[PDB]
């Protein structure tokens, strides 16, 4: 059922860098994930102009933010194009290798972790606030997969023998014990207001 | 040979806004075009991981900046994925309509023309410095096309019965009489240094 993969050397090095560097402006993770959601939503919206049958798996194009104080998780849901088994494993491993090298070269030359997105490696900023990340994704042309990683050099991929979602990506952030502020309504609102105000899709913050 | 199209109402309105608004920080056009080149280069690099035969039309992934004082043109060449007849006409017309609406709504609420890229309509900033724009593009799965526009509500598309380029996009900016500074070596270098320093591809400024 569950397949285990070692991260490429440079990616594993970037994650250790993000987990061990003292950096207080951790809030940047939300903008990076929202921006990735928005790009998946654009990818599906564009593919639907030439082939209107790609919106069969969901007509609605949006982003949902779901805090869960009990489970200590923050979930970012989108109905974007989603990702295939190949994207999760190979594709987002090969494209990452290039940008990871450039970003660490930049940080060496005194750059900021807040610049991570300029290198296409914005996802890894989730390890600033999360101890484990679970990604549930579904692309039209493949099955539903669960990607998971607590860093430490490896990630797992399995078929999601769980509740089905129509086309999209659901990112589950299992927060570190001291990062519970990102489960607070006014805090999420504050971050979204200052970093993701100009997103071309509706962003709905869920209440508890 | 030559097909003439009317721009969608909102796009034609955005171009009039950019051509008529007094705005001195015109230099932003270069970053917007370079960033679009870089995204075309990423699109081809990613499509080449799953299908290595897409790099048959050129192995090299780069951006070339070519000033021509005689012709009063600045050319931005890339070897990115390129664009089809459909992209030039329909696809980049429909996706633009959404972002154009959002950007003008933002500018009404006191936003800056320098924010144009956040709306995916960064291309139209070329009309800050250019009186006419010629786009020569070539995608693997279509022929070579020439797109042209001096704004004024219309653009032209024709098959390029000219010298063939392998996969990519070549943007030719016919500069306004008072925008010749963008043909100067030190000026282009200055703009590239401060706005496009973290591009994941080699940018070569051509000498004259
Ligand atoms: C496991 C993966 C590392 N992520 C959770 S992710 O990349 O941050 C991420 C990816 C997508 C996504 N779906 N389809 C698609 O193309 N993308 C995508 C978008 C932009 C860049 C790279 C990408 F693949 C998303 O909707 C949200 C995300 O948080
Ligand atoms: C006529 C068109 C309006 N442009 C000259 S452009 O969009 O600025 C522009 C487009 C491409 C391009 N080639 N393939 C591709 O997908 N793109 C693309 C990239 C990003 C966004 C939208 C896009 F189509 C490019 O390499 C350079 C550009 O200056």
Short mmCIF file of C-alpha atoms and ligand atoms in Angstrom, two decimals:
data_model
loop_
_atom_site.label_atom_id
_atom_site.label_comp_id
_atom_site.label_asym_id
_atom_site.label_seq_id
_atom_site.Cartn_x
_atom_site.Cartn_y
_atom_site.Cartn_z
CA UNK A 1 0.00 0.00 0.00
CA UNK A 2 2.38 2.73 1.34
CA UNK A 3 5.50 3.61 -0.82
CA UNK A 4 8.52 5.37 0.92
CA UNK A 5 10.90 7.68 -1.00
CA UNK A 6 14.07 9.47 -0.04
CA UNK A 7 14.02 13.19 -0.88
CA UNK A 8 16.72 14.41 -3.34
CA UNK A 9 19.87 15.49 -1.29
CA UNK A 10 19.42 19.26 -1.88
CA UNK A 11 15.66 19.26 -0.93
CA UNK A 12 16.38 17.33 2.32
CA UNK A 13 19.10 20.02 2.99
CA UNK A 14 16.62 22.88 2.30
CA UNK A 15 14.09 21.32 4.81
CA UNK A 16 16.80 20.99 7.53
CA UNK A 17 17.75 24.63 6.82
CA UNK A 18 14.06 25.74 7.26
CA UNK A 19 13.49 23.58 10.39
CA UNK A 20 16.79 24.60 12.19
CA UNK A 21 17.25 28.35 11.23
CA UNK A 22 16.07 30.86 13.83
CA UNK A 23 13.55 32.90 11.84
CA UNK A 24 10.62 34.64 13.55
CA UNK A 25 8.58 35.79 10.46
CA UNK A 26 7.05 32.25 10.07
CA UNK A 27 3.63 33.64 8.84
CA UNK A 28 4.95 33.63 5.17
CA UNK A 29 4.01 29.93 4.77
CA UNK A 30 0.29 30.85 4.19
CA UNK A 31 0.99 33.20 1.25
CA UNK A 32 3.25 30.55 -0.37
CA UNK A 33 0.54 27.82 -0.10
CA UNK A 34 -2.30 30.19 -1.21
CA UNK A 35 -0.22 31.29 -4.21
CA UNK A 36 0.38 27.61 -5.14
CA UNK A 37 -3.40 27.01 -4.83
CA UNK A 38 -4.09 29.99 -7.09
CA UNK A 39 -1.62 28.70 -9.74
CA UNK A 40 -3.40 25.26 -9.67
CA UNK A 41 -6.76 27.08 -10.12
CA UNK A 42 -5.35 29.07 -13.12
CA UNK A 43 -3.98 25.77 -14.64
CA UNK A 44 -7.49 24.19 -14.52
CA UNK A 45 -9.29 27.43 -15.64
CA UNK A 46 -6.97 27.70 -18.75
CA UNK A 47 -7.21 23.94 -19.61
CA UNK A 48 -11.07 24.39 -19.48
CA UNK A 49 -11.13 27.04 -22.30
CA UNK A 50 -9.87 24.49 -24.95
CA UNK A 51 -11.59 21.40 -23.32
CA UNK A 52 -14.78 22.31 -21.24
CA UNK A 53 -15.02 18.63 -19.97
CA UNK A 54 -12.18 19.18 -17.40
CA UNK A 55 -14.65 21.02 -15.06
CA UNK A 56 -16.81 17.84 -14.74
CA UNK A 57 -14.97 17.00 -11.44
CA UNK A 58 -16.09 20.39 -9.97
CA UNK A 59 -17.27 23.68 -11.54
CA UNK A 60 -16.29 25.86 -8.49
CA UNK A 61 -12.77 27.41 -8.37
CA UNK A 62 -11.90 28.47 -4.76
CA UNK A 63 -9.52 28.22 -1.75
CA UNK A 64 -10.72 27.11 1.76
CA UNK A 65 -8.76 27.63 4.99
CA UNK A 66 -9.80 25.24 7.75
CA UNK A 67 -8.36 25.43 11.28
CA UNK A 68 -8.98 22.51 13.69
CA UNK A 69 -7.88 23.25 17.31
CA UNK A 70 -8.69 19.68 18.46
CA UNK A 71 -6.48 18.01 15.74
CA UNK A 72 -4.02 21.04 15.84
CA UNK A 73 -4.15 21.22 12.00
CA UNK A 74 -4.56 23.97 9.42
CA UNK A 75 -5.91 22.77 6.11
CA UNK A 76 -5.59 24.60 2.78
CA UNK A 77 -8.16 23.25 0.29
CA UNK A 78 -8.28 24.14 -3.39
CA UNK A 79 -10.23 22.88 -6.40
CA UNK A 80 -7.31 23.48 -8.75
CA UNK A 81 -5.96 21.16 -11.44
CA UNK A 82 -4.61 18.72 -8.75
CA UNK A 83 -1.54 16.49 -9.08
CA UNK A 84 -0.69 13.02 -10.51
CA UNK A 85 1.43 10.25 -8.91
CA UNK A 86 4.28 11.43 -11.23
CA UNK A 87 3.96 15.12 -10.15
CA UNK A 88 4.12 14.23 -6.42
CA UNK A 89 7.12 11.93 -6.86
CA UNK A 90 9.38 12.73 -9.92
CA UNK A 91 8.15 16.05 -11.51
CA UNK A 92 8.09 18.21 -8.25
CA UNK A 93 11.42 16.62 -7.24
CA UNK A 94 13.36 17.45 -10.46
CA UNK A 95 12.05 21.08 -10.86
CA UNK A 96 12.70 21.70 -7.12
CA UNK A 97 16.46 20.64 -7.37
CA UNK A 98 17.25 23.76 -9.55
CA UNK A 99 15.42 26.38 -7.41
CA UNK A 100 16.62 24.82 -4.12
CA UNK A 101 20.29 25.26 -5.28
CA UNK A 102 19.60 28.94 -6.32
CA UNK A 103 17.76 29.79 -3.02
CA UNK A 104 20.51 28.38 -0.73
CA UNK A 105 23.13 30.18 -2.93
CA UNK A 106 21.06 33.38 -2.38
CA UNK A 107 20.73 32.83 1.48
CA UNK A 108 24.56 32.30 1.62
CA UNK A 109 24.84 35.81 -0.03
CA UNK A 110 22.66 37.16 2.87
CA UNK A 111 19.12 36.68 1.38
CA UNK A 112 15.84 36.15 3.34
CA UNK A 113 13.75 32.94 3.86
CA UNK A 114 10.72 35.21 2.91
CA UNK A 115 12.14 35.17 -0.69
CA UNK A 116 11.66 31.31 -1.00
CA UNK A 117 8.73 31.72 -3.50
CA UNK A 118 10.95 33.51 -6.09
CA UNK A 119 12.76 30.13 -6.49
CA UNK A 120 9.61 27.99 -6.88
CA UNK A 121 10.29 26.18 -3.56
CA UNK A 122 7.69 28.03 -1.46
CA UNK A 123 6.04 24.77 -0.27
CA UNK A 124 9.00 23.89 1.98
CA UNK A 125 8.24 27.00 4.11
CA UNK A 126 5.32 24.94 5.57
CA UNK A 127 8.03 23.21 7.76
CA UNK A 128 8.48 26.56 9.54
CA UNK A 129 5.15 25.89 11.34
CA UNK A 130 4.36 22.19 10.67
CA UNK A 131 5.92 19.03 12.17
CA UNK A 132 4.18 16.85 9.50
CA UNK A 133 2.50 17.76 6.16
CA UNK A 134 -0.21 15.61 4.49
CA UNK A 135 -1.15 16.44 0.89
CA UNK A 136 -4.39 14.86 -0.53
CA UNK A 137 -4.57 15.49 -4.28
CA UNK A 138 -6.70 14.42 -7.27
CA UNK A 139 -6.01 15.18 -10.97
CA UNK A 140 -8.63 14.27 -13.65
CA UNK A 141 -6.25 11.83 -15.45
CA UNK A 142 -5.11 9.82 -12.31
CA UNK A 143 -6.40 8.53 -8.94
CA UNK A 144 -6.54 10.17 -5.51
CA UNK A 145 -3.17 10.10 -3.68
CA UNK A 146 -1.94 10.91 -0.16
CA UNK A 147 1.58 12.41 0.11
CA UNK A 148 3.02 12.75 3.65
CA UNK A 149 6.29 13.81 5.26
CA UNK A 150 7.61 14.66 8.74
CA UNK A 151 10.85 15.67 6.87
CA UNK A 152 13.81 13.56 8.08
CA UNK A 153 14.87 12.72 4.51
CA UNK A 154 11.78 10.77 3.44
CA UNK A 155 8.18 11.11 2.24
CA UNK A 156 5.37 8.54 1.70
CA UNK A 157 2.88 8.13 -1.18
CA UNK A 158 -0.18 5.78 -1.07
CA UNK A 159 -3.62 5.60 -2.82
CA UNK A 160 -6.11 7.45 -0.61
CA UNK A 161 -8.50 4.70 0.64
CA UNK A 162 -10.40 7.57 2.27
CA UNK A 163 -13.29 9.97 1.51
CA UNK A 164 -13.21 11.14 -2.12
CA UNK A 165 -12.65 14.75 -3.16
CA UNK A 166 -13.31 16.00 -6.65
CA UNK A 167 -10.34 17.50 -8.56
CA UNK A 168 -8.00 19.52 -6.29
CA UNK A 169 -5.37 19.64 -3.57
CA UNK A 170 -5.94 19.61 0.20
CA UNK A 171 -2.78 20.52 2.29
CA UNK A 172 -2.91 19.50 5.97
CA UNK A 173 -0.47 21.23 8.25
CA UNK A 174 0.10 19.41 11.57
CA UNK A 175 1.36 22.42 13.55
CA UNK A 176 4.32 22.42 15.99
CA UNK A 177 3.13 22.79 19.65
CA UNK A 178 4.23 26.51 19.74
CA UNK A 179 2.60 27.45 16.38
CA UNK A 180 -1.08 27.27 17.51
CA UNK A 181 -1.49 31.05 16.64
CA UNK A 182 -2.18 29.97 13.04
CA UNK A 183 -5.41 28.27 14.28
CA UNK A 184 -6.73 31.70 15.51
CA UNK A 185 -9.35 33.45 13.34
CA UNK A 186 -8.01 37.04 13.69
CA UNK A 187 -4.41 35.83 13.01
CA UNK A 188 -5.25 33.97 9.69
CA UNK A 189 -7.38 37.00 8.63
CA UNK A 190 -4.46 39.35 9.39
CA UNK A 191 -1.97 37.23 7.28
CA UNK A 192 -4.42 36.74 4.36
CA UNK A 193 -5.24 40.54 4.37
CA UNK A 194 -1.54 41.65 4.14
CA UNK A 195 -0.09 38.84 1.91
CA UNK A 196 -2.91 37.40 -0.30
CA UNK A 197 -5.34 40.36 -0.86
CA UNK A 198 -4.98 40.18 -4.72
CA UNK A 199 -5.78 36.48 -5.34
CA UNK A 200 -8.20 36.00 -8.28
CA UNK A 201 -10.33 33.39 -6.46
CA UNK A 202 -12.59 33.47 -3.34
CA UNK A 203 -10.73 32.60 -0.11
CA UNK A 204 -13.03 31.36 2.66
CA UNK A 205 -11.81 31.20 6.21
CA UNK A 206 -13.83 28.53 8.11
CA UNK A 207 -15.10 29.23 11.63
CA UNK A 208 -15.10 26.63 14.46
CA UNK B 1 -2.74 36.22 -45.11
CA UNK B 2 -3.19 38.82 -42.29
CA UNK B 3 -6.16 38.32 -39.84
CA UNK B 4 -7.42 41.40 -37.79
CA UNK B 5 -9.10 41.02 -34.38
CA UNK B 6 -10.72 43.47 -32.03
CA UNK B 7 -9.40 43.24 -28.45
CA UNK B 8 -11.99 42.34 -25.74
CA UNK B 9 -13.54 45.66 -24.36
CA UNK B 10 -11.77 45.51 -20.95
CA UNK B 11 -8.28 44.78 -22.46
CA UNK B 12 -8.63 47.71 -24.93
CA UNK B 13 -9.60 49.85 -21.84
CA UNK B 14 -6.52 48.62 -19.88
CA UNK B 15 -4.21 49.57 -22.85
CA UNK B 16 -5.76 53.10 -23.08
CA UNK B 17 -5.27 53.40 -19.29
CA UNK B 18 -1.54 52.42 -19.64
CA UNK B 19 -0.94 54.66 -22.70
CA UNK B 20 -2.72 57.80 -21.25
CA UNK B 21 -1.86 57.69 -17.44
CA UNK B 22 1.04 59.90 -16.36
CA UNK B 23 3.38 57.37 -14.75
CA UNK B 24 7.15 57.94 -14.67
CA UNK B 25 8.35 54.48 -13.38
CA UNK B 26 8.04 52.97 -16.93
CA UNK B 27 11.12 50.64 -16.43
CA UNK B 28 8.80 47.90 -14.91
CA UNK B 29 7.93 46.61 -18.41
CA UNK B 30 11.27 44.67 -18.62
CA UNK B 31 10.70 42.67 -15.41
CA UNK B 32 7.15 41.77 -16.56
CA UNK B 33 8.40 40.48 -19.97
CA UNK B 34 11.43 38.64 -18.44
CA UNK B 35 9.15 36.99 -15.87
CA UNK B 36 6.79 35.86 -18.70
CA UNK B 37 9.85 34.47 -20.57
CA UNK B 38 10.94 32.59 -17.44
CA UNK B 39 7.45 31.06 -16.99
CA UNK B 40 7.54 29.87 -20.68
CA UNK B 41 11.01 28.34 -20.01
CA UNK B 42 9.66 26.52 -16.87
CA UNK B 43 6.62 25.25 -18.91
CA UNK B 44 8.98 23.66 -21.51
CA UNK B 45 11.49 22.38 -18.86
CA UNK B 46 8.63 20.60 -16.93
CA UNK B 47 6.98 19.17 -20.12
CA UNK B 48 10.48 17.75 -21.02
CA UNK B 49 10.72 15.58 -17.82
CA UNK B 50 7.72 13.36 -18.89
CA UNK B 51 8.42 13.65 -22.71
CA UNK B 52 12.19 14.31 -23.57
CA UNK B 53 11.26 14.80 -27.32
CA UNK B 54 9.93 18.38 -26.67
CA UNK B 55 13.55 19.72 -26.53
CA UNK B 56 14.16 18.62 -30.18
CA UNK B 57 13.32 22.22 -31.32
CA UNK B 58 16.16 23.58 -29.09
CA UNK B 59 18.03 22.16 -26.06
CA UNK B 60 19.10 25.63 -24.70
CA UNK B 61 16.81 27.44 -22.20
CA UNK B 62 17.70 31.20 -22.05
CA UNK B 63 16.55 34.85 -22.40
CA UNK B 64 18.25 37.33 -24.84
CA UNK B 65 17.86 41.12 -24.71
CA UNK B 66 18.65 42.81 -28.02
CA UNK B 67 18.66 46.60 -28.43
CA UNK B 68 18.75 48.07 -31.98
CA UNK B 69 19.30 51.88 -32.04
CA UNK B 70 18.87 52.04 -35.85
CA UNK B 71 15.41 50.29 -35.81
CA UNK B 72 14.62 51.85 -32.32
CA UNK B 73 13.56 48.39 -31.05
CA UNK B 74 14.22 46.31 -27.94
CA UNK B 75 13.78 42.59 -28.47
CA UNK B 76 13.19 40.02 -25.73
CA UNK B 77 13.99 36.52 -27.02
CA UNK B 78 13.26 33.30 -25.16
CA UNK B 79 13.41 29.60 -26.02
CA UNK B 80 10.41 28.80 -23.82
CA UNK B 81 7.42 26.60 -24.66
CA UNK B 82 6.14 29.23 -27.21
CA UNK B 83 2.49 29.88 -28.11
CA UNK B 84 -0.15 28.44 -30.51
CA UNK B 85 -2.58 30.35 -32.79
CA UNK B 86 -5.26 29.64 -30.10
CA UNK B 87 -3.09 31.01 -27.23
CA UNK B 88 -2.39 34.29 -29.09
CA UNK B 89 -6.03 34.81 -30.04
CA UNK B 90 -8.61 33.13 -27.66
CA UNK B 91 -6.70 31.69 -24.61
CA UNK B 92 -4.69 34.90 -23.68
CA UNK B 93 -7.84 36.96 -24.32
CA UNK B 94 -10.19 35.01 -21.97
CA UNK B 95 -7.69 34.64 -19.03
CA UNK B 96 -6.77 38.36 -19.39
CA UNK B 97 -10.48 39.55 -19.03
CA UNK B 98 -10.56 38.39 -15.32
CA UNK B 99 -7.21 39.92 -14.21
CA UNK B 100 -7.81 43.15 -16.20
CA UNK B 101 -11.11 43.70 -14.26
CA UNK B 102 -9.33 43.03 -10.88
CA UNK B 103 -6.34 45.34 -11.71
CA UNK B 104 -8.51 48.33 -12.77
CA UNK B 105 -10.70 47.73 -9.64
CA UNK B 106 -7.42 47.83 -7.61
CA UNK B 107 -6.12 51.07 -9.37
CA UNK B 108 -9.54 52.72 -8.63
CA UNK B 109 -8.85 51.88 -4.90
CA UNK B 110 -5.49 53.76 -5.28
CA UNK B 111 -3.18 50.87 -6.41
CA UNK B 112 0.02 51.19 -8.55
CA UNK B 113 0.63 50.30 -12.26
CA UNK B 114 3.83 48.52 -10.94
CA UNK B 115 1.44 45.88 -9.42
CA UNK B 116 0.13 44.84 -12.94
CA UNK B 117 1.97 41.43 -12.78
CA UNK B 118 -0.01 40.29 -9.68
CA UNK B 119 -3.09 40.20 -11.99
CA UNK B 120 -1.44 38.22 -14.83
CA UNK B 121 -1.69 41.21 -17.22
CA UNK B 122 1.98 42.28 -17.04
CA UNK B 123 2.41 42.17 -20.86
CA UNK B 124 0.25 45.30 -21.36
CA UNK B 125 2.90 47.35 -19.46
CA UNK B 126 4.98 47.13 -22.69
CA UNK B 127 2.69 49.97 -24.02
CA UNK B 128 4.28 52.24 -21.40
CA UNK B 129 7.41 52.37 -23.63
CA UNK B 130 6.31 50.89 -27.01
CA UNK B 131 4.16 52.42 -29.78
CA UNK B 132 3.85 48.97 -31.50
CA UNK B 133 4.57 45.41 -30.23
CA UNK B 134 5.42 42.47 -32.53
CA UNK B 135 5.39 38.97 -31.02
CA UNK B 136 7.02 36.11 -33.06
CA UNK B 137 6.20 32.76 -31.44
CA UNK B 138 6.59 29.03 -32.19
CA UNK B 139 5.12 26.12 -30.17
CA UNK B 140 6.08 22.49 -31.04
CA UNK B 141 2.46 21.51 -31.91
CA UNK B 142 1.68 24.51 -34.29
CA UNK B 143 3.33 26.79 -36.88
CA UNK B 144 5.25 30.06 -36.48
CA UNK B 145 2.96 33.09 -35.99
CA UNK B 146 3.41 36.88 -35.92
CA UNK B 147 1.14 38.82 -33.51
CA UNK B 148 1.21 42.64 -33.80
CA UNK B 149 -0.59 45.61 -32.26
CA UNK B 150 -0.21 49.40 -32.12
CA UNK B 151 -3.15 49.23 -29.59
CA UNK B 152 -6.15 51.24 -30.88
CA UNK B 153 -8.56 48.36 -30.21
CA UNK B 154 -7.11 45.82 -32.65
CA UNK B 155 -4.30 43.29 -33.16
CA UNK B 156 -3.17 41.25 -36.22
CA UNK B 157 -2.17 37.57 -36.53
CA UNK B 158 -0.52 36.04 -39.67
CA UNK B 159 1.75 33.01 -40.43
CA UNK B 160 5.35 34.23 -40.25
CA UNK B 161 6.64 33.94 -43.87
CA UNK B 162 9.98 35.03 -42.40
CA UNK B 163 13.18 33.49 -40.96
CA UNK B 164 12.42 30.45 -38.81
CA UNK B 165 13.11 30.29 -35.07
CA UNK B 166 13.05 27.06 -33.12
CA UNK B 167 10.55 26.82 -30.23
CA UNK B 168 10.14 30.13 -28.34
CA UNK B 169 8.85 33.68 -28.19
CA UNK B 170 10.55 36.83 -29.53
CA UNK B 171 8.94 40.14 -28.32
CA UNK B 172 9.82 43.24 -30.38
CA UNK B 173 9.22 46.57 -28.71
CA UNK B 174 9.06 49.50 -31.16
CA UNK B 175 9.89 52.26 -28.65
CA UNK B 176 8.18 55.67 -28.41
CA UNK B 177 10.54 58.51 -29.56
CA UNK B 178 11.19 59.61 -25.90
CA UNK B 179 11.87 56.05 -24.58
CA UNK B 180 15.29 55.50 -26.28
CA UNK B 181 16.92 55.11 -22.77
CA UNK B 182 15.88 51.43 -22.88
CA UNK B 183 18.32 50.95 -25.83
CA UNK B 184 21.27 52.00 -23.55
CA UNK B 185 23.52 49.23 -22.18
CA UNK B 186 24.00 50.62 -18.63
CA UNK B 187 20.22 51.34 -18.35
CA UNK B 188 19.06 47.74 -19.29
CA UNK B 189 21.80 46.35 -16.95
CA UNK B 190 20.54 48.60 -14.12
CA UNK B 191 16.86 47.43 -14.58
CA UNK B 192 17.79 43.72 -14.94
CA UNK B 193 20.07 43.95 -11.80
CA UNK B 194 17.32 45.46 -9.52
CA UNK B 195 14.19 43.64 -10.90
CA UNK B 196 15.26 40.27 -12.45
CA UNK B 197 18.37 39.19 -10.42
CA UNK B 198 16.73 35.86 -9.30
CA UNK B 199 15.66 34.42 -12.70
CA UNK B 200 16.55 30.70 -13.04
CA UNK B 201 17.86 31.06 -16.62
CA UNK B 202 20.83 32.92 -18.22
CA UNK B 203 19.94 36.47 -19.37
CA UNK B 204 22.28 37.80 -22.06
CA UNK B 205 22.34 41.47 -22.87
CA UNK B 206 23.55 41.93 -26.49
CA UNK B 207 26.07 44.66 -27.33
CA UNK B 208 25.91 46.82 -30.51
C1 LIG C 1 2.79 18.31 -2.88
C2 LIG C 1 3.30 19.72 -3.24
C3 LIG C 1 4.79 19.81 -2.83
N1 LIG C 1 2.46 20.87 -2.78
C4 LIG C 1 1.53 20.69 -1.65
S1 LIG C 1 2.49 22.37 -3.52
O1 LIG C 1 3.31 22.30 -4.69
O2 LIG C 1 2.74 23.37 -2.55
C5 LIG C 1 0.84 22.68 -4.07
C6 LIG C 1 0.52 22.24 -5.33
C7 LIG C 1 -0.74 22.44 -5.87
C8 LIG C 1 -0.94 22.06 -7.28
N2 LIG C 1 -1.90 21.33 -7.75
N3 LIG C 1 -1.68 21.22 -9.13
C9 LIG C 1 -0.56 21.91 -9.45
O3 LIG C 1 -0.03 22.05 -10.54
N4 LIG C 1 -0.08 22.45 -8.31
C10 LIG C 1 1.07 23.27 -8.23
C11 LIG C 1 0.92 24.66 -8.19
C12 LIG C 1 2.05 25.48 -8.10
C13 LIG C 1 3.32 24.94 -8.04
C14 LIG C 1 3.50 23.55 -8.11
C15 LIG C 1 2.37 22.72 -8.22
F1 LIG C 1 2.55 21.39 -8.30
C16 LIG C 1 -1.73 23.04 -5.10
O4 LIG C 1 -2.97 23.19 -5.60
C17 LIG C 1 -1.45 23.46 -3.81
C18 LIG C 1 -0.17 23.27 -3.29
O5 LIG C 1 0.07 23.67 -2.01
C1 LIG C 2 1.60 37.52 -26.93
C2 LIG C 2 1.64 37.62 -25.39
C3 LIG C 2 0.55 38.61 -24.95
N1 LIG C 2 2.99 37.85 -24.78
C4 LIG C 2 4.07 38.44 -25.58
S1 LIG C 2 3.34 37.42 -23.19
O1 LIG C 2 2.24 36.70 -22.64
O2 LIG C 2 3.87 38.54 -22.50
C5 LIG C 2 4.69 36.28 -23.29
C6 LIG C 2 4.37 34.95 -23.41
C7 LIG C 2 5.35 33.97 -23.47
C8 LIG C 2 4.90 32.57 -23.46
N2 LIG C 2 5.26 31.63 -24.29
N3 LIG C 2 4.57 30.47 -23.90
C9 LIG C 2 3.80 30.77 -22.82
O3 LIG C 2 3.06 30.03 -22.19
N4 LIG C 2 4.00 32.06 -22.52
C10 LIG C 2 3.39 32.74 -21.43
C11 LIG C 2 4.11 32.92 -20.25
C12 LIG C 2 3.53 33.59 -19.18
C13 LIG C 2 2.24 34.09 -19.26
C14 LIG C 2 1.49 33.89 -20.43
C15 LIG C 2 2.06 33.21 -21.50
F1 LIG C 2 1.32 33.01 -22.62
C16 LIG C 2 6.69 34.34 -23.50
O4 LIG C 2 7.64 33.39 -23.61
C17 LIG C 2 7.05 35.67 -23.41
C18 LIG C 2 6.06 36.65 -23.32
O5 LIG C 2 6.44 37.96 -23.28
#
